[PDB]
Amino acid sequence: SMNPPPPETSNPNKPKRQTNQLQYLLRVVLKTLWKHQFAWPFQQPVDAVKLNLPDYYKIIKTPMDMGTIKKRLENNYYWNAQECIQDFNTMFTNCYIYNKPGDAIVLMAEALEKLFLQKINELPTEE
Amino acid sequence: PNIINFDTSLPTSHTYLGADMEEFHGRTLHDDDSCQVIPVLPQVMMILIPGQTLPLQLFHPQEVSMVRNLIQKDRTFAVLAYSNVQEREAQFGTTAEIYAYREEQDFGIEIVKVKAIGRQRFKVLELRTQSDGIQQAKVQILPECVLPSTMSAVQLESLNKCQIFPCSYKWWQKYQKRKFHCANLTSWPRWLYSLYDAETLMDRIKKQLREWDENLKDDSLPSNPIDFSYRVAACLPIDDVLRIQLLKIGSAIQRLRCELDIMNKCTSLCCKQCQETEITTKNEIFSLSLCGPMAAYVNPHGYVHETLTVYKACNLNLIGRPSTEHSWFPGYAWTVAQCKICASHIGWKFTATKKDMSPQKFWGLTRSALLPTIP
Amino acid sequence: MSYNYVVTAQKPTAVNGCVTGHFTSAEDLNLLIAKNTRLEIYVVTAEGLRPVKEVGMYGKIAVMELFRPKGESKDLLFILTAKYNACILEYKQSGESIDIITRAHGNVQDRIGRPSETGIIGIIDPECRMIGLRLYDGLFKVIPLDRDNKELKAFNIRLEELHVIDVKFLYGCQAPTICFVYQDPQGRHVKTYEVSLREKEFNKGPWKQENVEAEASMVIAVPEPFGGAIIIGQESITYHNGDKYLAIAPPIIKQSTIVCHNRVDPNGSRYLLGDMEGRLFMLLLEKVTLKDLRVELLGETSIAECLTYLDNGVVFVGSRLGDSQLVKLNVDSNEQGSYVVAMETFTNLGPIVDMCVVDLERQGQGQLVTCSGAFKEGSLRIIRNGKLHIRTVPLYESPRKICYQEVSQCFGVLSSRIEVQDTSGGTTALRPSASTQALSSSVSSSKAPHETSFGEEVEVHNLLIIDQHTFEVLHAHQFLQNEYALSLVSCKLGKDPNTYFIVGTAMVYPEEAEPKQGRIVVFQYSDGKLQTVAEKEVKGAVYSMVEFNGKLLASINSTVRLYEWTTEKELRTECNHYNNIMALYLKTKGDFILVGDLMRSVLLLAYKPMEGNFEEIARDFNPNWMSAVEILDDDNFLGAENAFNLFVCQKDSAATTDEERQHLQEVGLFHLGEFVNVFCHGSLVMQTPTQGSVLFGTVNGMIGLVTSLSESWYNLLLDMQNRLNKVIKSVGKIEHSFWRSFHTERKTEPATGFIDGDLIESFLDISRPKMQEVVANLQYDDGSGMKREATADDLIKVVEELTRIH
Numbered sequence A: 001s002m003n004p005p006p007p008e009t010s011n012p013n014k015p016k017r018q019t020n021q022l023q024y025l026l027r028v029v030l031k032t033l034w035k036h037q038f039a040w041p042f043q044q045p046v047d048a049v050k051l052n053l054p055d056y057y058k059i060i061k062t063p064m065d066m067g068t069i070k071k072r073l074e075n076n077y078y079w080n081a082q083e084c085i086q087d088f089n090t091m092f093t094n095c096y097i098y099n100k101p102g103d104a105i106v107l108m109a110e111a112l113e114k115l116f117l118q119k120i121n122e123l124p125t126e127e
Numbered sequence B: 001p002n003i004i005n006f007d008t009s010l011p012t013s014h015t016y017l018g019a020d021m022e023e024f025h026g027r028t029l030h031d032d033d034s035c036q037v038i039p040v041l042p043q044v045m046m047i048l049i050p051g052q053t054l055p056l057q058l059f060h061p062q063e064v065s066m067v068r069n070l071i072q073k074d075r076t077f078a079v080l081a082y083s084n085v086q087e088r089e090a091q092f093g094t095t096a097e098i099y100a101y102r103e104e105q106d107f108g109i110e111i112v113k114v115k116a117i118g119r120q121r122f123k124v125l126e127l128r129t130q131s132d133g134i135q136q137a138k139v140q141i142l143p144e145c146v147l148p149s150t151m152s153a154v155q156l157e158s159l160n161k162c163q164i165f166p167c168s169y170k171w172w173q174k175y176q177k178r179k180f181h182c183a184n185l186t187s188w189p190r191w192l193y194s195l196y197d198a199e200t201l202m203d204r205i206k207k208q209l210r211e212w213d214e215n216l217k218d219d220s221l222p223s224n225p226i227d228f229s230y231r232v233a234a235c236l237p238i239d240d241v242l243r244i245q246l247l248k249i250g251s252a253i254q255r256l257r258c259e260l261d262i263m264n265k266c267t268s269l270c271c272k273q274c275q276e277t278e279i280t281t282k283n284e285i286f287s288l289s290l291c292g293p294m295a296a297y298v299n300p301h302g303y304v305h306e307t308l309t310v311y312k313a314c315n316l317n318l319i320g321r322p323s324t325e326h327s328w329f330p331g332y333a334w335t336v337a338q339c340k341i342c343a344s345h346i347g348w349k350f351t352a353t354k355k356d357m358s359p360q361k362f363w364g365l366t367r368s369a370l371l372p373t374i375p
Numbered sequence C: 001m002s003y004n005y006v007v008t009a010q011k012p013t014a015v016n017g018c019v020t021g022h023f024t025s026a027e028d029l030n031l032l033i034a035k036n037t038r039l040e041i042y043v044v045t046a047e048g049l050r051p052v053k054e055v056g057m058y059g060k061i062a063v064m065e066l067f068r069p070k071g072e073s074k075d076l077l078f079i080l081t082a083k084y085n086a087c088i089l090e091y092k093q094s095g096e097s098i099d100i101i102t103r104a105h106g107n108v109q110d111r112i113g114r115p116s117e118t119g120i121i122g123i124i125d126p127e128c129r130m131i132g133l134r135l136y137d138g139l140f141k142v143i144p145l146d147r148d149n150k151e152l153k154a155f156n157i158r159l160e161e162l163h164v165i166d167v168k169f170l171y172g173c174q175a176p177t178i179c180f181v182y183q184d185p186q187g188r189h190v191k192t193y194e195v196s197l198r199e200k201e202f203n204k205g206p207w208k209q210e211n212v213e214a215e216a217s218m219v220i221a222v223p224e225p226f227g228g229a230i231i232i233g234q235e236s237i238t239y240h241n242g243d244k245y246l247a248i249a250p251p252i253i254k255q256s257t258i259v260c261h262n263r264v265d266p267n268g269s270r271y272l273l274g275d276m277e278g279r280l281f282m283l284l285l286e287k288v289t290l291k292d293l294r295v296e297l298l299g300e301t302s303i304a305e306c307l308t309y310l311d312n313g314v315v316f317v318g319s320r321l322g323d324s325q326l327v328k329l330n331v332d333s334n335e336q337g338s339y340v341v342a343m344e345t346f347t348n349l350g351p352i353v354d355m356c357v358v359d360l361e362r363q364g365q366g367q368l369v370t371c372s373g374a375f376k377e378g379s380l381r382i383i384r385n386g387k388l389h390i391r392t393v394p395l396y397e398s399p400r401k402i403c404y405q406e407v408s409q410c411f412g413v414l415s416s417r418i419e420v421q422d423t424s425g426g427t428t429a430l431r432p433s434a435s436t437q438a439l440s441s442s443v444s445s446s447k448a449p450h451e452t453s454f455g456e457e458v459e460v461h462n463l464l465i466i467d468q469h470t471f472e473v474l475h476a477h478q479f480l481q482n483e484y485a486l487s488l489v490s491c492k493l494g495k496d497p498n499t500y501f502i503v504g505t506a507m508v509y510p511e512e513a514e515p516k517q518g519r520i521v522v523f524q525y526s527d528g529k530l531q532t533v534a535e536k537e538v539k540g541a542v543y544s545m546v547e548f549n550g551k552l553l554a555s556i557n558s559t560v561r562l563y564e565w566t567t568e569k570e571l572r573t574e575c576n577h578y579n580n581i582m583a584l585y586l587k588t589k590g591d592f593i594l595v596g597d598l599m600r601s602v603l604l605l606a607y608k609p610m611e612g613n614f615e616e617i618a619r620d621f622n623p624n625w626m627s628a629v630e631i632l633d634d635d636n637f638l639g640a641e642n643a644f645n646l647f648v649c650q651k652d653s654a655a656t657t658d659e660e661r662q663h664l665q666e667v668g669l670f671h672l673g674e675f676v677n678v679f680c681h682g683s684l685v686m687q688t689p690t691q692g693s694v695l696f697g698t699v700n701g702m703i704g705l706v707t708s709l710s711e712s713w714y715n716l717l718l719d720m721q722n723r724l725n726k727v728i729k730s731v732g733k734i735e736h737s738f739w740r741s742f743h744t745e746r747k748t749e750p751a752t753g754f755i756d757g758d759l760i761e762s763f764l765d766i767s768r769p770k771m772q773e774v775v776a777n778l779q780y781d782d783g784s785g786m787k788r789e790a791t792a793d794d795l796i797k798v799v800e801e802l803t804r805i806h
């Protein structure tokens, strides 16, 4: 029952900038994936205490959720869009790995990842 | 208590299921005692009652393929009433005819939202799991055993001209003394056959239902005794075992009798897991949907909960902030409700968004978590 | 797997319809009487009547009308049965061998249609052009009366007026015209139609619709030269004939609703009317067109089910609730102010609601004491075989229950009389009954918003202790206000050697649908006075009580409770049993207890003396209205149900599976034709192929006996019935298997596990050639194990042994 503290969202030493890619990801991709009706399990970090999953964090070594991504985008933690895309794919990969294929949460993650990949090809070049 | 200005048609519309669906006006009704082979949905663990509107949200490719198959044929699927659902043990059930469907694109995966209605009770004869995984069921339809007037056998040939009738309890005493007169020819009196008459029990249940639903009995309640009994059973907050025992009843007279007996006895609703924590009372039950105070609803997860709307609810803790996302009652926000002792999920406290609305706050409890109790 | 034998010990005595005409001959005057499943023909003489023929049919006579089409010498008889078997019959007499030949027959039952609330309504056109049948709502069936219609083909016509109350064919019209009273949301109306045979439809009538009385019940077709139709309700007797519109409102008929009528003068100048309470009025029509209507109270007859005017001024009154009457109508009132004088009384044992078997005179010669009749026609009937001697004790109040007490040499009878609200404050009796003329009479002690009304009826229940020898109302104890007596037992309980009358009651109130309060009261009778010994309150109605091994088994709504008799003379609860149904029927046998609901819900429990409570053995649920239950034996339980039917259920003690040990197999079904009421153990013959004897009473006065047979005897009797159905002609040619088939409108099955005794006992009536034909190639006497051939004398001896059980 570790339930490790959620990933850090703000870093005062880290520089703050609002590139075109990051503000697009925050104002388009994250808003769309947040107002979706399959997004509630990823709005919050996996509370392994409630769900009684003592093996989630022992298998998932790099946890991630869309709420952490939101709090990182709002604090300008990201320097480039590669970090945000890596975090999104890390969340999707953790959800795929821990569960068995064909489960409900797996299909919801597949839906969200398909929408994310069809919304990420619309990536405008930096200003 | 308070007054209401919500306009209740929206609960029945299930506006949370996207936009306007593709409505079907046809009706497929099979004959009595006719054994049909019907597919069974996998993720439906509900004891459906005829007439009860059932919403569904399915996204499994297996589920969507079966739905596309059924839309092309007769739009009828079986809903098993499981005695022990941990092993899919079914003996009774109720058919459900689809009347609205909507597949949604610009969406991650292929998903279909459906509104169906219960049709015909049935007994389960054979449950066969295909190589696909989806299961079929060979199934005998159960007939509606409506019995004739209990005095038509005794009836005097000369009194046949007095069997048509052109301060309510005076009228009911007149009705009793005029209809069941020939009871003096039997070993039992008139007030005993009044307990087994259809209209007397219907009026008693109407008196009991005027407490909850403020809609007049002129149009909202059905006229047929069988339809009336089914409409009453659709909104009876009882556990699964008693709902099974109620669906077993074929004769509508015994259905109405057991319904009024339950309404007389069960006064308090406690938590099912606690068994010793009063959640609410029958007096606080008020109707917010046209279907009644308790109606079935579906969430984005895909689960179907039988929500009963009450004015007050005791012994409950509140979890989470209010949220209007996929709210079953438009204009209100829900908040998770746990039991005060076992923390089991009991329902949701629905609070109004606009301040002009009424009621400003009510409760919607799921039927699966409640248990009726007599003091 | 039932093996049962039912036999009729008393043919039905109730009269459910009668007519007059010229059936046997044109010069004769014939009176035809219907007794449910019996038809009686008489020739009217100046003496009174003369019995010429009595026949039995395979159907309950619902419609019975006489008519003569243009071309016949004498009248023909149309008859419809409860199973919708229609037949037109003719009389034939050659010397002494009389035969009722079938002129036409047919099954007119449609494939679809809900039976109407007014029942079967069969009428005939004056010019004999068609026969009209009202069976289903919104469907009028027509049978054209032509010389070729031998299968009785009928066609349906649609009605816009769904709820039809009554209908009659009008007199004096070119086209066959019907006049009927119907109801719509606007009120009750009368309307006429013209039935077309070319178009098979309806045309507008000779006069448009009228808005009549809200309680317009009866319609009378007036013959020429008057014409038109009379509409009679509770408060107005109007008349319509084209433009002729006459209306009266005589207050003399406001005291009771008129039910039946009959035509006196063939031209339609005088009519007899009978109300519910039995009053007989005269309706006079005064004279090209009608002048005025007048109602004059002739007198007081029995509660008339039907009326008919013979001749000489003699009238016959058929009554189901009481004895049938032959009366005389004088032209001058007597001393009491009546025009009616009784001439003769015909016995009518219906309705039988309870009875008991006693060894009265001879020890062994059993006699049956039955509570018969209702209202002023109520009575006690003492029946013993000599064909059957019957003693009548009229009580002038409705009886309900009855039992016998041997040590006190008396009978306990539950009765109820009707009283009206007093003008000041109380109740007043309409007539002095047995409860208001007893040698001693007391009331009970003790343990009501919106009280009384303006002149409404109320029931008052009494327990009457009556001597077995003199039949004088010894004691008439009255119960409490707003109380209904249900059960009655006479027994000894505990170590107390005193025999007690135990009565169960129920507090019935206008606001309470189901009674939540009741009493169990224990009386003792001695020295010509009744003292209330014990009283115990319960939370419901005490529908029935039973003596159970020195204890008292009572039913209180949905509860079965056992009471012990303490030394302090108080009822002490031992063990309860809570069920899913309200225990209406209670029966016992040793340690088995049988519980029955109104909707055929059967339960069988067993008492556990070492454990001290009740344990569920078996049960069965098949929704159908019931009436009476009886325990045949350990594994056989008999009952009656809707549509005049009997059934027998079996259990399986050993059996195989615990899930199926708790089920009752429907091993026997049968269609009786009489609504059964109360079964009871006993036998009327001096004290074998049979084992057991249970008598049963019915509504139309019929009394029967049920007994148990073996396997070989059951198979032999089934073969005998199958053989006798072929050679015996049926009145109207109705199939015997179609008559004895369990006929409910929800399901129709053949009869199994039951041997009809009336068919087996008619074996001796036919001639010897038919005997040698029926016994031909039998050899189903599998009693020895192999085949035993049969002869005629063997079967004659066997049948005469089967006639020596009743």
Ligand SMILES: [Zn+2]
Pocket (backbone or CB within 6 Å): B271, B272, B273, B274, B275, B277, B339, B340, B341, B342, B343, B344
């Ligand atoms: Zn709880």
